[PDB]
Structures are given as structure tokens and as C-alpha cells.
Amino acid sequence: AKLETVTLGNIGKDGKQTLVLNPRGVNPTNGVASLSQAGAVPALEKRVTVSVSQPKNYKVQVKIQNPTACTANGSCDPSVTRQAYADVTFSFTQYSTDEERAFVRTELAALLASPLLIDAIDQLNPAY
Amino acid sequence: AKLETVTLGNIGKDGKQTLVLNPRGVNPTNGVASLSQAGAVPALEKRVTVSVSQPNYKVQVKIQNPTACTANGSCDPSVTRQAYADVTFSFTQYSTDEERAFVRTELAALLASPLLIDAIDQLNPA
Amino acid sequence: IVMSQSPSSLAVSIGEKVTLTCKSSQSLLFSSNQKNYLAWYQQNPGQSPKLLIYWASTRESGVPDRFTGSGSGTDFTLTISSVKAEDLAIYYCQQYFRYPAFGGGT
Amino acid sequence: VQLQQSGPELVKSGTSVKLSCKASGYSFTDHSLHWVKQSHGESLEWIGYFSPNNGGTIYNQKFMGKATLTVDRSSSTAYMDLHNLTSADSAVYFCSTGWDYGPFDSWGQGTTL
Numbered sequence: 195a196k197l198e199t200v201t202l203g204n205i206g207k208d209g210k211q212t213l214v215l216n217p218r219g220v221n222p223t224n225g226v227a228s229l230s231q232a233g234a235v236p237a238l239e240k241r242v243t244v245s246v247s248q249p250k251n252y253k254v255q256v257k258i259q260n261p262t263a264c265t266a267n268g269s270c271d272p273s274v275t276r277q278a279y280a281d282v283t284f285s286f287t288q289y290s291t292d293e294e295r296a297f298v299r300t301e302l303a304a305l306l307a308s309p310l311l312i313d314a315i316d317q318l319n320p321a322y
Numbered sequence: 323a324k325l326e327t328v329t330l331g332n333i334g335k336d337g338k339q340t341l342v343l344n345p346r347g348v349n350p351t352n353g354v355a356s357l358s359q360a361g362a363v364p365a366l367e368k369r370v371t372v373s374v375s376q377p378n379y380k381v382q383v384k385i386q387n388p389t390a391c392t393a394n395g396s397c398d399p400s401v402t403r404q405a406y407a408d409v410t411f412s413f414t415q416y417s418t419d420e421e422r423a424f425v426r427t428e429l430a431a432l433l434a435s436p437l438l439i440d441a442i443d444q445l446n447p448a
Numbered sequence: 449i450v451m452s453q454s455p456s457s458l459a460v461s462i463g464e465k466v467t468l469t470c471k472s473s474q475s476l477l478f479s480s481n482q483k484n485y486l487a488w489y490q491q492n493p494g495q496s497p498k499l500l501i502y503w504a505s506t507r508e509s510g511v512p513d514r515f516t517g518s519g520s521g522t523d524f525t526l527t528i529s530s531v532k533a534e535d536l537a538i539y540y541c542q543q544y545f546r547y548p549a550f551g552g553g554t
Numbered sequence: 555v556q557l558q559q560s561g562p563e564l565v566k567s568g569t570s571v572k573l574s575c576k577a578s579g580y581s582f583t584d585h586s587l588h589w590v591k592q593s594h595g596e597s598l599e600w601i602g603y604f605s606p607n608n609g610g611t612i613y614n615q616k617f618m619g620k621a622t623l624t625v626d627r628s629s630s631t632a633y634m635d636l637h638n639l640t641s642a643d644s645a646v647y648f649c650s651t652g653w654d655y656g657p658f659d660s661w662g663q664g665t666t667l
Binding site: 195196197198200202203204205206207209211213220225227240242244245246252254256258260262275276277278279280281282283284285286287289290292293294295296297298299300301302303304305306307308309310311312313314315316317318319320321322 | 323324325326328330331332333334335337339341348353355368370372373374379381383385387389402403404405406407408409410411412413414416417419420421422423424425426427428429430431432433434435437438439440441442443444445446447448
Binding site: 208209 | 478479480481483485502503506509
């Protein structure tokens with residue numbers, strides 16, 4: 195899976211926005227591939243990191259990090275006020291066929307669009 | 323919203339399966355809401371637990387899928403291996419609705435991208 | 449990109465299940481995930497047009513259910529579910545990634 | 555979000571023109587303000603936009619000479635000029651807005667030339 199530009203569509207609350215994000219190499223220290231949006235400022239861009247490990251089981255980790263900028267008085271370069279995170283960690287075992295892993299990935303993907311999660315995440319109301 | 327039956331369509335490798343799951347109560351000790359499939363055996367049941375904290379709001383979603391196997395010289399099947407999944411959102415106090423919706427949709431759409439469908443199915447680094 | 453659409457005029461009067469066909473000269477699966485990039489606009493002869501469908505299969509808020517569409521790699525269609533007294537006039541189609549380009553007629 | 559203002563400009567000859575689009579209710583932080591032209595008849599074709607995150611000076615080909623899109627961020631208005639007016643000035647020039655790469659959401663009424 196060679197790194198390449200990823201254009202995510204239908205993103206947003208209204209399902210109208212879309213974002214293009216391009217790779218920025220792999221860290222040799224721990225093999226964590228990184229991708230980010232060309233936001234003209236390195237400190238105020240949305241970034242994604244993906245890394246699959248090696249065994250006694252495999253572990254896939256995906257992190258999403260996007261900051262929110264603000265122009266505070268007394269300075270010219272905008273700083274970072276608040277920062278939104280997201281973490282995902284699959285923990286498949288050695289003897290797991292690809293069908294089971296695909297099932298896990300698909301149910302996780304479709305569970306983030308069901309009426310339960312799109313409500314428990316947007317308004318932070320606990321499920322009862 | 324209160325817990326209710328959740329049905330998921332176009333699930334699987336080819337998107338030709340459907341997974342229906344129903345609630346299984348709420349644990350009062352730590353406030354996790356559970357859901358599970360009607361698998362007719364409590365041990366071999368795909369389950370999903372969702373829980374939001376109260377202050378740095380934190381949202382945690384945990385998915386457990388065990389797999390069965392015919393025990394040698396026995397009748398009751400045992401859980402040979404389990405597939406795990408975890409999601410942890412960490413929105414702050416002043417975050418608006420648009421930012422959280424954007425993060426959720428990003429995680430939902432990126433997870434079906436050609437990069438992730440190969441990183442997860444084929445276990446090859448990017 | 450060029451968007452060659454079905455001939456300018458139709459001949460349906462009322463109630464008939466009439467379909468609008470659009471054909472592109474290039475693949476429109478620009479998005480990494482398989483999402484098309486078409487939008488269907490209808491323009492009355494008097495004022496500015498309105499958006500009806502984006503992603504070629506998703507309706508826009510505040511639009512009646514008659515307008516539905518299906519999308520393939522490059523051969524898309526718009527299937528209005530019967531026509532009422534005022535659902536006439538030009539039905540433009542547009543791809544809207546990188547350089548947009550309209551094209552078509554009634 | 556709504557946007558309006560126009561003016562039935564009827565000036566002749568190729569001296570100059572100044573069309574404007576006073577957009578309100580939205581900020582230029584991510585959105586793009588397109589300038590689609592309808593001409594007269596069939597098939598209105600795009601004329602460019604202004605995206606701060608994408609450059610803000612993307613112009614359609616075969617329209618580079620007679621187009622100039624300058625946007626003032628103080629009052630949130632976008633206006634353009636056409637240098638030479640011989641036969642391009644035919645009919646309405648719509649003013650459009652939308653997301654960064656999304657569809658065209660809402661169009662204000664256009665000037666008549």
C-alpha cells in the first residue's frame with residue numbers, strides 16, 4: 195500500500211464538504227505513516243497517522259488530530275486554542291482470516307453513521 | 323437518545339450482509355451502554371459498548387467479535403479467538419458541534435478509503 | 449471535462465415516468481472513497497436555479513421526493529418520479545471537482 | 555446564507571465594467587465564491603472563483619484576458635472587472651457560493667448586460 199493523496203468526500207455535518215490530504219513520509223523510528231492537509235501553516239493543519247505493528251498479535255493504530263485556530267490580540271501569528279483528537283486501535287490475532295478483519299472494519303465504519311452514534315457524538319448525550 | 327435496535331446494512335467484504343443488534347442494558351457502575359447480536363449463545367455474541375464521560379468530554383466505543391470452534395471431544399464450543407476494536411474521541415469543553423461532526427465523519431469515511439481497507443485487511447504498512 | 453447531455457427537448461406531458469440521461473467523457477470517481485461528483489440543477493426561465501441532487505444520489509434539504517438519481521462510473525441518470533404542473537424548464541448537470549463545467553438542456 | 559446586489563449595467567463599447575456581489579452571512583475562511591456566467595441561451599459555464607485556501611486566483615481558460623476577480627475581506631464583498639467588452643457582454647452573470655470543493659449551494663440574482 196504505497197502512500198498517495200487521499201481525497202475524502204461527503205465529509206461534514208451536512209455531507210457537503212470534502213478534503214484532500216497528502217502524505218508526509220514515514221517516521222523511521224517507529225514506522226508511523228503520516229498524512230496531512232496543505233493548510234499553508236504547519237501548525238494549523240489536520241493530520242492523520244496510521245501504523246500497523248508486527249508480532250503475539252497484530253495491532254493497527256490510527257490517530258486523527260485537528261486543531262482550531264484563533265487570532266488573539268497582542269500577536270500576529272495565530273496560535274492553537276483547542277484540539278480535537280480521535281483514536282482507533284484494532285487488535286487482530288495471528289490466526290484471523292481477512293474476512294473477519296474486514297467484517298470488523300465494516301461494522302465499525304457503518305456504526306459511526308447509525309442514528310445512535312451520530313447523536314451520542316454530536317451532542318454528547320449518553321445512551322440510556 | 324434511549325437505546326434501541328440498531329440494524330447495519332451492506333456489511334462485510336462484499337457488502338452483502340446485514341447485522342441486527344439489540345441493547346443489553348446499561349451498567350450503573352461506570353455508565354457503559356451495551357449492545358449485542360441475538361446469537362442464541364451468550365458466550366459467542368458480537369458486542370458493542372459505547373460510553374461518554376463527564377468532566378474534557380471523552381467518548382469510548384469498544385467492539386468485541388469472538389469466533390467459535392468445535393471442541394475436540396466435547397460439545398460446548400469455546401471462544402478460540404476474539405477480534406477487538408476501540409475508538410476514543412477526546413473533544414474539549416469549548417468545541418462546537420461542527421468540529422465534532424467533522425471528526426466523526428472523517429473517521430467514518432477514512433475507514434473505507436483504499437488505504438485503510440488494505441492496511442486492515444492485508445496487514446501491510448503504508 | 450465535457451458533459452454531453454440528452455437532447456435539448458423532451459415530449460412528456462403529465463404523469464409519465466420520464467428519465468433524464470447524462471454522459472461524461474471522463475471518469476468522475478475523483479473521491480478516494482467511491483463517491484461521484486455530480487450535481488443536478490434546475491433553472492426556471494425567470495430567476496436563478498436551485499440545487500437538487502449532489503453526489504448523484506443524495507437529495508438536498510427542502511426538495512420533494514420526486515427527484516431521485518443513480519450513478520455509475522460515467523453514465524448517470526436522473527429519474528423524476530412523475531411530473532407535475534411546474535417541474536419543467538432546463539435541468540442542468542454539472543461536475544464540480546477542480547474545474548467545474550455545466551452542459552445540457554430541458 | 556444569502557447573497558445579492560447586481561445592477562442592470564447597460565454601458566456599451568469595450569472601455570470597462572465593474573460588477574459586484576455583496577455576500578452576507580458567511581465568511582471566506584473555507585468557502586469559495588464562484589462567478590459562473592450564463593451567457594444567453596443554453597449552458598452557463600464557469601468563470602473562476604476565489605478560494606483563500608486554494609489560491610484565490612483560479613481562472614477558467616479562454617477567459618483569462620477579460621477577467622479579474624478581486625475580493626475585499628473587510629466588508630465581505632466580491633467584485634470583478636472585464637477589461638474588453640466587444641461581444642462577450644451578452645446576458646446575465648450569476649454570482650455563486652459553495653464549499654471548498656462542494657457543489658454550488660445558493661445563487662443570487664445576476665446583473666443584466
